[PDB]
Amino acid sequence: LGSAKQQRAEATERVTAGLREVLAARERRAQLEAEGLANLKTLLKVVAVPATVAKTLDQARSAEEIADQVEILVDQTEKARELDVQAVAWLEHAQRTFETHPLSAASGDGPGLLTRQGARLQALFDTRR
Amino acid sequence: GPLGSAKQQRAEATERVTAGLREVLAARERRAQLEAEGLANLKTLLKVVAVPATVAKTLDQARSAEEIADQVEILVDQTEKARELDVQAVAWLEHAQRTFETHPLSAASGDGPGLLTRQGARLQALFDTRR
């Protein structure tokens, strides 16, 4: 309505104000997300945190990084369950071996090397964890 | 001859004593050597099934069956403690998934699936408390 010159002045002003509006929103979003990340960590800590990830949890700079630490923990738990399987298998074999070997087996003179550890061993063996 | 035959008697008496010691010694030595063989073969038998690094690192070096037993107990210790950690980690992972699913920063929005979604399978696997 105003002028040839004033028409232009409003037209660009829409562009610059629109930019300011965009930047303002991004800024506000960053800081609330920072608050959200802070509070995410607080929530995650309500249940005891494995030392594995606790060592690094506070340092995570985003939710994505925490998810990564989660994925690490999952991998590690998978690998540990794999080793358990192997360890029980070897322990079963080792106990069998010891029980029939002249160097270890119980004799007339008392118990074998693994005797006093038998109960504990059987627990590990009995079909769980 | 007189001196000679007398001397050969002393020599024989001397040898009987030396032979007696040698006899006793040889028995001790042979027992040691056979127990050594036994320890070697014990390790060979033990290796027929894959040996955890806990025990494998030191097994060949073990000076007796007793040392191997010590290490066995360690392995048992480690396996106990590991099973304790499994319990704790599953507990936390459950809590973690529960939390991620309802949190604005991670939960699925209009723009796609949540952050942990792609881990759903593995997570559920671990959760269905096998092993």
Coordinates of all heavy atoms in Angstrom, one line a residue, chain B residues 34-78:
Chain B
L34 N 57.1 -90.2 35.9 CA 55.8 -90.7 35.5 C 54.7 -89.8 35.9 O 53.7 -89.6 35.2 CB 55.6 -92.2 36.0 CG 56.5 -93.2 35.3 CD1 56.2 -94.6 35.8 CD2 56.2 -93.1 33.8
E35 N 54.8 -89.2 37.1 CA 53.9 -88.2 37.5 C 53.9 -87.0 36.6 O 52.9 -86.3 36.3 CB 54.1 -87.7 39.0 CG 53.7 -88.8 39.9 CD 53.9 -88.5 41.4 OE1 54.6 -87.5 41.6 OE2 53.5 -89.3 42.2
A36 N 55.1 -86.7 36.1 CA 55.3 -85.6 35.1 C 54.5 -86.0 33.9 O 53.8 -85.1 33.3 CB 56.8 -85.3 34.9
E37 N 54.7 -87.2 33.4 CA 54.0 -87.7 32.2 C 52.5 -87.6 32.4 O 51.8 -87.2 31.5 CB 54.4 -89.1 31.9 CG 55.8 -89.4 31.4 CD 56.1 -88.6 30.1 OE1 55.2 -88.6 29.2 OE2 57.2 -88.2 29.9
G38 N 52.1 -88.0 33.6 CA 50.7 -87.9 34.0 C 50.1 -86.5 33.9 O 49.0 -86.3 33.4
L39 N 50.9 -85.5 34.4 CA 50.4 -84.1 34.3 C 50.3 -83.6 32.8 O 49.4 -82.9 32.5 CB 51.4 -83.2 35.1 CG 51.1 -81.7 35.0 CD1 49.8 -81.3 35.7 CD2 52.3 -80.9 35.6
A40 N 51.3 -84.1 32.0 CA 51.3 -83.7 30.6 C 50.0 -84.2 29.9 O 49.3 -83.5 29.2 CB 52.5 -84.3 29.9
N41 N 49.7 -85.5 30.2 CA 48.6 -86.1 29.6 C 47.3 -85.6 30.1 O 46.3 -85.6 29.4 CB 48.7 -87.6 29.8 CG 47.7 -88.4 28.9 OD1 47.7 -88.2 27.7 ND2 46.9 -89.2 29.5
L42 N 47.3 -85.2 31.4 CA 46.1 -84.6 32.0 C 45.8 -83.3 31.2 O 44.6 -83.1 30.9 CB 46.4 -84.2 33.5 CG 45.3 -83.4 34.1 CD1 44.0 -84.1 34.1 CD2 45.7 -83.0 35.6
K43 N 46.8 -82.5 30.9 CA 46.5 -81.3 30.1 C 46.0 -81.6 28.7 O 45.1 -80.9 28.2 CB 47.8 -80.5 30.0 CG 48.3 -79.8 31.3 CD 49.8 -79.4 31.2 CE 50.2 -78.8 32.5 NZ 51.6 -78.4 32.5
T44 N 46.6 -82.7 28.1 CA 46.1 -83.1 26.8 C 44.7 -83.5 26.8 O 43.9 -83.1 26.0 CB 47.0 -84.3 26.3 OG1 48.3 -83.9 26.2 CG2 46.5 -84.8 24.9
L45 N 44.3 -84.3 27.8 CA 42.9 -84.7 28.0 C 42.0 -83.4 28.2 O 41.0 -83.3 27.6 CB 42.8 -85.6 29.2 CG 43.4 -87.0 29.0 CD1 43.6 -87.8 30.3 CD2 42.7 -87.8 28.0
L46 N 42.4 -82.5 29.0 CA 41.7 -81.3 29.3 C 41.4 -80.5 28.1 O 40.4 -79.8 27.9 CB 42.4 -80.5 30.4 CG 42.3 -81.0 31.8 CD1 43.1 -80.1 32.8 CD2 40.8 -81.1 32.3
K47 N 42.4 -80.5 27.1 CA 42.2 -79.7 25.9 C 41.3 -80.3 24.8 O 41.1 -79.7 23.8 CB 43.6 -79.5 25.3 CG 44.5 -78.5 26.0 CD 45.9 -78.7 25.4 CE 46.9 -77.8 26.0 NZ 48.2 -78.3 25.7
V48 N 40.8 -81.6 25.1 CA 40.0 -82.2 24.1 C 38.7 -81.4 23.9 O 38.1 -81.5 22.8 CB 39.7 -83.7 24.6 CG1 38.6 -84.3 23.7 CG2 41.0 -84.5 24.5
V49 N 38.3 -80.7 24.9 CA 37.2 -79.8 24.8 C 37.7 -78.4 24.9 O 38.6 -78.1 25.7 CB 36.1 -80.0 25.9 CG1 35.2 -78.8 26.1 CG2 35.3 -81.3 25.6
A50 N 37.2 -77.5 24.1 CA 37.8 -76.1 24.0 C 37.9 -75.5 25.4 O 37.0 -75.5 26.2 CB 36.8 -75.2 23.1
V51 N 39.1 -74.9 25.6 CA 39.4 -74.4 27.0 C 39.2 -72.8 27.0 O 39.9 -72.1 26.3 CB 40.9 -74.7 27.3 CG1 41.2 -74.3 28.7 CG2 41.1 -76.2 27.1
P52 N 38.4 -72.3 27.9 CA 38.2 -70.9 28.2 C 39.6 -70.2 28.4 O 40.4 -70.8 29.0 CB 37.4 -70.9 29.4 CG 36.6 -72.1 29.4 CD 37.5 -73.2 28.7
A53 N 39.7 -68.9 28.0 CA 41.0 -68.2 28.1 C 41.5 -68.1 29.5 O 42.7 -68.1 29.8 CB 40.9 -66.9 27.4
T54 N 40.5 -67.8 30.4 CA 40.8 -67.9 31.8 C 41.7 -69.0 32.2 O 42.7 -68.8 33.0 CB 39.4 -68.0 32.6 OG1 38.6 -66.8 32.4 CG2 39.7 -68.2 34.1
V55 N 41.5 -70.2 31.7 CA 42.2 -71.4 32.1 C 43.3 -71.6 31.0 O 44.5 -72.0 31.4 CB 41.3 -72.6 32.2 CG1 42.1 -73.8 32.3 CG2 40.3 -72.5 33.3
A56 N 43.0 -71.3 29.8 CA 44.0 -71.6 28.7 C 45.2 -70.8 28.8 O 46.3 -71.2 28.4 CB 43.3 -71.3 27.4
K57 N 45.2 -69.5 29.3 CA 46.3 -68.7 29.4 C 47.5 -69.3 30.2 O 48.6 -69.2 29.9 CB 46.0 -67.3 30.0 CG 46.3 -66.1 29.1 CD 45.6 -64.8 29.5 CE 44.1 -64.9 29.3 NZ 43.4 -63.7 29.8
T58 N 47.1 -70.1 31.1 CA 48.1 -70.6 32.1 C 48.2 -72.2 32.2 O 49.0 -72.7 32.9 CB 47.7 -70.2 33.5 OG1 46.3 -70.3 33.7 CG2 48.1 -68.7 33.7
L59 N 47.3 -72.8 31.4 CA 47.2 -74.3 31.6 C 48.5 -75.0 31.3 O 48.9 -75.9 32.0 CB 46.1 -74.8 30.7 CG 46.0 -76.3 30.5 CD1 45.7 -77.0 31.8 CD2 44.8 -76.7 29.5
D60 N 49.1 -74.7 30.2 CA 50.4 -75.4 29.8 C 51.5 -75.2 30.8 O 52.4 -76.0 30.9 CB 50.8 -74.9 28.4 CG 50.0 -75.5 27.2 OD1 49.7 -76.7 27.3 OD2 49.6 -74.8 26.3
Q61 N 51.4 -74.1 31.5 CA 52.5 -73.7 32.4 C 52.2 -74.3 33.8 O 53.2 -74.3 34.6 CB 52.5 -72.2 32.5 CG 53.1 -71.5 31.3 CD 52.1 -71.0 30.3 OE1 50.9 -71.3 30.5 NE2 52.5 -70.4 29.2
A62 N 51.1 -74.9 34.0 CA 50.7 -75.4 35.4 C 51.7 -76.4 35.8 O 52.1 -77.3 35.1 CB 49.3 -76.0 35.4
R63 N 52.1 -76.3 37.1 CA 53.2 -77.2 37.6 C 52.6 -78.4 38.3 O 53.3 -79.3 38.6 CB 54.0 -76.4 38.7 CG 55.0 -75.5 38.1 CD 55.9 -74.9 39.2 NE 55.2 -74.2 40.3 CZ 55.7 -73.7 41.4 NH1 57.0 -73.8 41.6 NH2 54.9 -73.1 42.3
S64 N 51.3 -78.4 38.4 CA 50.6 -79.6 39.1 C 49.1 -79.6 38.8 O 48.5 -78.6 38.3 CB 50.7 -79.5 40.6 OG 50.0 -78.5 41.2
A65 N 48.5 -80.7 39.0 CA 47.0 -80.8 38.9 C 46.3 -79.9 39.9 O 45.2 -79.3 39.6 CB 46.6 -82.2 39.2
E66 N 46.9 -79.6 41.0 CA 46.4 -78.7 42.0 C 46.3 -77.3 41.5 O 45.3 -76.6 41.7 CB 47.3 -78.7 43.3 CG 47.0 -79.8 44.2 CD 47.6 -81.2 43.8 OE1 48.3 -81.3 42.8 OE2 47.4 -82.1 44.6
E67 N 47.3 -76.8 40.7 CA 47.2 -75.5 40.1 C 46.0 -75.4 39.2 O 45.3 -74.4 39.1 CB 48.4 -75.0 39.4 CG 49.7 -74.9 40.2 CD 50.8 -74.1 39.4 OE1 50.4 -73.4 38.5 OE2 51.9 -74.2 39.9
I68 N 45.8 -76.5 38.4 CA 44.7 -76.5 37.5 C 43.4 -76.4 38.3 O 42.5 -75.6 37.9 CB 44.8 -77.7 36.6 CG1 46.1 -77.8 35.9 CG2 43.7 -77.7 35.5 CD1 46.2 -79.0 35.0
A69 N 43.3 -77.1 39.4 CA 42.1 -77.0 40.2 C 41.9 -75.6 40.8 O 40.8 -75.1 40.8 CB 42.3 -78.0 41.4
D70 N 43.0 -74.9 41.1 CA 42.8 -73.5 41.6 C 42.2 -72.7 40.5 O 41.3 -71.9 40.7 CB 44.2 -72.9 41.9 CG 44.8 -73.5 43.2 OD1 44.0 -74.0 44.0 OD2 46.0 -73.3 43.3
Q71 N 42.7 -72.9 39.2 CA 42.2 -72.1 38.1 C 40.8 -72.4 37.8 O 40.0 -71.6 37.4 CB 43.2 -72.3 36.9 CG 43.0 -71.3 35.8 CD 43.1 -69.9 36.3 OE1 42.5 -69.0 35.7 NE2 44.0 -69.6 37.3
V72 N 40.4 -73.7 38.0 CA 39.1 -74.2 37.7 C 38.1 -73.4 38.6 O 37.1 -73.0 38.2 CB 39.0 -75.7 38.0 CG1 37.5 -76.1 38.3 CG2 39.5 -76.4 36.8
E73 N 38.5 -73.2 39.9 CA 37.7 -72.6 40.8 C 37.5 -71.1 40.5 O 36.4 -70.5 40.6 CB 38.2 -72.7 42.2 CG 37.5 -71.9 43.2 CD 38.3 -71.0 44.0 OE1 39.4 -71.4 44.5 OE2 37.9 -69.8 44.1
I74 N 38.6 -70.5 40.0 CA 38.5 -69.1 39.4 C 37.4 -69.0 38.3 O 36.6 -68.2 38.4 CB 39.9 -68.6 38.9 CG1 40.9 -68.5 40.0 CG2 39.7 -67.3 38.2 CD1 40.4 -67.8 41.2
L75 N 37.6 -69.9 37.4 CA 36.6 -69.9 36.2 C 35.2 -70.0 36.8 O 34.3 -69.4 36.2 CB 36.9 -71.1 35.3 CG 35.9 -71.3 34.2 CD1 36.0 -70.1 33.2 CD2 36.2 -72.5 33.4
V76 N 35.0 -70.8 37.8 CA 33.7 -71.0 38.4 C 33.3 -69.6 39.0 O 32.2 -69.2 38.8 CB 33.7 -72.1 39.5 CG1 32.4 -72.0 40.3 CG2 33.8 -73.4 38.8
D77 N 34.2 -69.0 39.8 CA 34.0 -67.7 40.3 C 33.5 -66.7 39.2 O 32.5 -66.1 39.4 CB 35.2 -67.1 41.0 CG 35.3 -67.5 42.4 OD1 34.3 -67.4 43.1 OD2 36.4 -67.9 42.9
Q78 N 34.3 -66.6 38.2 CA 34.0 -65.7 37.1 C 32.7 -65.9 36.4 O 31.9 -65.0 36.1 CB 35.1 -65.8 36.0 CG 36.5 -65.4 36.5 CD 37.5 -65.6 35.4 OE1 37.2 -66.1 34.3 NE2 38.8 -65.2 35.7

